UniProtKB/Swiss-Prot annotation:
Protein name in the entry: Deleted in azoospermia-like
Mutagenesis or variant effect for residue 53 to D: Abolishes RNA-binding but not homodimerization
Predominant location: cytoplasm
Family stated for the protein in its record: Belongs to the RRM DAZ family.
Oligomer and partners: Homodimer and heterodimer. Forms a heterodimer with DAZ. Interacts with BOLL, DAZAP1 and DAZAP2. Interacts with PUM2. Multiple DAZL RRMs can bind to a single RNA containing multiple GUU triplets.
Keyword Magnesium attached: no
Gene Ontology molecular function, alphabetical: identical protein binding; mRNA 3'-UTR binding; translation activator activity
Record bears the keyword Phosphoprotein: yes
Compartments in which it is found: Cytoplasm
Lineage, opening ranks: Eukaryota, Metazoa, Chordata, Craniata, Vertebrata
Domain notes: The DAZ domain mediates the interaction with DAZAP1 and DAZAP2.
GO cellular component: cytoplasm; nucleus; protein-containing complex; ribosome
Sequence segments annotated as region (Homodimerization): 46-81
First and last residues shown, out of full length: 35 to 115 of 298
């Protein structure tokens, strides 16, 4: 599959975090285009999702800047089709 530019995978999303909180947070990295929280067939979060940006954002640099992978922290990664 192909690495999606300007999109970041977000793992470990708490049930309390919503699309607005995610949008608000990721605005610090650029103009946010879409936030998708992946849900099961009942529309309950599976605990992960994707954030895409309008602009060229250096997603790999953001991913590589993570230093704390404790359970509560969001796990960022590249988004691959």
């Amino acid at each position: 599959g192909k690495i999606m530019p300007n999109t970041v995978f977000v793992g470990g999303i708490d049930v309390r975090m919503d699309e607005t909180e995610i949008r608000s947070f990721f605005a610090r990295y650029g103009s946010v285009k879409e936030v998708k929280i992946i849900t099961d067939r009942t529309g309950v979060s599976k605990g992960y999702g994707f954030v895409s940006f309008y602009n060229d954002v250096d997603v790999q640099k953001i991913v590589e800047s993570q230093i704390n992978f404790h359970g509560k922290k969001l796990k960022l990664g590249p988004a691959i089709r």
